[PDB]
Ligand binder design. Structure first.
Ligand SMILES: CCOC(=O)[C@@H](C)c1cccc(C(=O)c2ccccc2)c1
Ligand SMILES: CCOC(=O)[C@@H](C)c1cccc(C(=O)c2ccccc2)c1
Lengths: 387, 387
């Protein structure tokens, strides 16, 4: 039966999500799709055609893919030290949980940024030795700050381990977007437009709403913590509209980031996901050669018995490649999948996957910040059970 | 029986040493003393009255004692970073045996210099990752270069471990002499004269010969390796005059060092050794307080299974304090001693000890570079056996 509809309708009928859309493609054509709920519970307006979602860290596979294209074109290489493009990242320091600070003993490379092994942290990282200083600097909160300037502020702060020696999910994709700009002399949003969005016909994807976009933007629900102080336990899961402060502008022509900030649609993101099965547009144009796509997807960071964790949340059986998660042990997995399934997700509960063993892609779009309910994994599992 | 004479005479009669003097004091007055052999085997001139010896690293306890006086007087402290006095030692790097170089993760302190834990090495260190670059720079060989200038060259080279983390006998006492000059605005030789030599009436001790000193200087025998390349096995122990090149001038008024370079006499060095029993001159003037002398003599570096070693030669049962060796386990010792016996020695086979349990001091003066025979320890053992 249609387990995907069941999952989505149950979430809407339990007042856990306002509105959900999903699509599963196989061999580049839709095989399951649906929608549940509404654009916003306040007016119960129906989900519009080509509804728009804040995809947060589903920005990261796109920016990472751009970096792989630029590696293929010779702009830089995985081993390139980022200080060669921005000397503000020369002479980094490292801080630990015992207040000890010392010089970094390795240079940060492009590969370190793509694997979150550079030693950067994130503003909302609970218990982190440096996240308090990120929050004081408002690195994430101040979305009106130009990327180039935010990077100058970040560069003055210490790392939390020596580059290459550990893994911690981080602001490093934003550093990557910035280093792309340094290396090319172009803006990351223009490069994304020319190299990825326009060839794949992702006309609704970008760091600002399209002209007719305000009426299609889905409402975002959830509770962002006071002052950005990382919470010690989950807030109650309640459909209250979320206040984004100045972190996620809708119409700032200079807003651009590497780790979040894109708006997109279900249809646009599926075009990107389907492309990742081959590296080609549907017309057959190559965005990334098979050899470099294989380089990008191969498991690259392997985890100990604790596994891959973000703020202590597990990604069971997943390793990390240059674009995001990749399933490397079905026997350790916590929900239905196949070896080699890859993809990523965002904090407003958007989720996608690519499953090469089934020539399958899937994406769930919704807007709930810090959900206590893993809707993305639930929908993936339903789709796996159906195919 | 006079074991000391028997040892010394056997060494002279076996053509191993040209000339030997010794004196052992108890309670500040001589109990055993003697001489054997000649000033030089070429003319067989007898050892002159107030014969002069190149004491090499028996310079180090003198310069270290000076540093303790300056600590007592508030000039600097054990924890003082040396870069505060000479910024050429900011931003040190560390090299390892696998060609890897990285920034030092700790600042070098005065204490590190006094304990040879700063990470410096020495030109003649066999197998050392950096000693080839010391030799290329001629740090030891170029005795005509001003101390201040040698330090500038040394400061550009990497350490061989992070400061504080290991022990390696080193050029750090020369760094200490230079930092003393930076901290005080005075020259180390003027400070030694005023603070130590003049109070102890050590009128023949200094970095150049007295005006009547040339005829009193003992000839120096042995083989220095060609180009300074550290030898893979001992050279034959043969009494041939040694060529010191420009490493050890006799009449350069600006030659001064921390780790070697002093000329002295048996009588002068015994005045210094006897003072180390109390921190006082024989007239009762305090050069160093009892509390700071105890701080200087307390065992400070402890060694693992292989023990304290220099170029793989062992100092069995010895630990390191701020002035040199200190006996911390008679059950591990390789020759007669008592708990707390301390002192040092030099590469031309001069040797001294202070034994607080016996209120005893002893010194052996001779001139043979890189002796295969441990004459100093043999004479200490003889004297211990005669009490
Ligand atoms: C998936 C992408 O989200 C991120 O990981 C970073 C980029 C991010 C960026 C901007 C805003 C937020 C939050 O609003 C938030 C974070 C943690 C808990 C509750 C809310 C998070
Ligand atoms: C005790 C003080 O030894 C030193 O610190 C330096 C000043 C030194 C200076 C000049 C010559 C030598 C050697 O002749 C030698 C070194 C190693 C092996 C064999 C011979 C050593």
């Amino acid at each position: 039966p249609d387990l995907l509809t069941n999952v989505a309708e149950n979430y809407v009928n339990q007042d856990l999500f306002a509105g959900i859309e999903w699509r599963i493609d196989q061999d580049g054509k839709p095989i399951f799709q649906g929608c549940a709920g509404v654009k916003d519970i306040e007016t119960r307006t129906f989900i519009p055609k080509n509804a728009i979602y804040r995809i947060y860290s589903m920005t990261k596979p796109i920016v990472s893919f751009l970096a792989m294209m630029l590696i293929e074109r010779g702009v830089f290489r995985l081993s390139s030290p980022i200080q060669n493009f921005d000397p503000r990242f020369k002479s980094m320091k490292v801080i630990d949980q015992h207040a000890h600070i010392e010089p970094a003993t390795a240079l940060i490379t492009i590969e370190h940024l793509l694997t979150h092994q550079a030693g950067f942290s994130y503003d909302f990282s609970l218990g982190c030795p440096i996240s308090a200083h990120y929050r004081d600097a408002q690195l994430i909160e101040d979305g009106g700050r130009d990327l180039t300037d935010m990077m100058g502020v970040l560069a003055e702060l210490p790392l939390v381990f020596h580059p290459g020696t550990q893994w911690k999910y981080s602001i490093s994709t934003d550093v990557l977007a910035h280093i792309i700009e340094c290396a090319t002399g172009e803006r990351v949003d223009d490069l994304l437009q020319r190299l990825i969005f326009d060839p794949l016909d992702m006309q609704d994807t970008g760091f600002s709403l399209p002209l007719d976009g305000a009426s299609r933007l889905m409402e975002v629900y959830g509770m962002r913590s006071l002052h950005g102080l990382p919470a010690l336990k989950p807030a109650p899961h309640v459909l209250v509209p979320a206040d984004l402060g100045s972190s996620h502008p809708t119409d700032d022509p200079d807003f651009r980031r590497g780790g979040h900030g894109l708006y997109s649609t279900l249809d646009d993101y599926m075009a990107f996901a389907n492309m990742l099965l081959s590296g080609q547009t549907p017309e057959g144009e190559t965005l990334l050669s098979p050899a470099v796509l294989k380089l990008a997807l191969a498991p690259r960071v392997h985890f100990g018995a604790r596994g891959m964790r973000i703020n202590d949340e597990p990604f069971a059986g997943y390793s990390w490649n240059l674009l995001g998660r990749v399933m490397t042990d079905v026997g350790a997995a916590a929900y239905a999948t196949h070896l080699g399934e890859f993809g990523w997700s965002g904090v407003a509960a958007t989720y996608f996957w690519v499953d090469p063993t089934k020539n399958m892609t899937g994406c769930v779009m919704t807007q709930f910040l810090g959900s206590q309910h893993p809707i993305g994994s639930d929908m993936q599992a339903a789709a796996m059970s159906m195919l």
